[PDB]
Amino acid sequence: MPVITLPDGSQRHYDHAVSPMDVALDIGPGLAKACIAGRVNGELVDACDLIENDAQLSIITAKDEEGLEIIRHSCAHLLGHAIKQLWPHTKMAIGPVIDNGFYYDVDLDRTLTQEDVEALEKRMHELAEKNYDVIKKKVSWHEARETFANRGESYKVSILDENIAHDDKPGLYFHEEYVDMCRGPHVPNMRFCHHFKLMKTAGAYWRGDSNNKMLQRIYGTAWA
């Protein structure tokens, strides 16, 4: 029966687990509509993550620097969703939110030209405008490995083999037919990711090792 304490000290008593989105809705329609994620006992969580016990909660919106960072991170997922449609055999490596933007390192035999990047951004806009829900699922290490192995995503598989413990539960984020892996949080719906643009591309060695393949780093930025 969690007691949720908000930043101003107000408390909400519940007799069942509730997510940040559930609480936002209880507070009001405006806050629920603005809700991107939550901070529970100091840690960022997705808006759909259940809060089982008494906790301090803060609702994250686009007015928070954290909300902007989450929007940027989900735009990296959007880039993957789009690039996988334009060039299906593209392999996804790492795509983080960085200062002032985001990027995604990709393995594609085709060297992307300015026109290709423009085509990629165009598809991203079309997909984001569909306002689809981002579906999160926490799975076992092996379940995540099989998901990516079946998609031929060798870099994601390498990440599981070398950088994620067998006892950790990878977070999978589904964007329609596209799936990515992350600690998140990510936006609850792509309606929060309509304002972005792709910039330039650069070369980036996988794992920073010049003996490994030089991937194409696609930079972008987003705002809200």
Ligand SMILES: Nc1ncnc2c1ncn2[C@@H]1O[C@H](COS(=O)(=O)NC(=O)[C@@H](N)CO)[C@@H](O)[C@H]1O
């Ligand atoms: N439980 C976890 N679930 C998923 N990723 C995790 C987890 N713990 C640690 N990670 C690491 O966090 C990385 C996320 O990297 S990221 O650059 O922020 N994001 C991504 O590469 C993609 N989500 C695309 O945006 C994963 O590749 C993995 O190395």
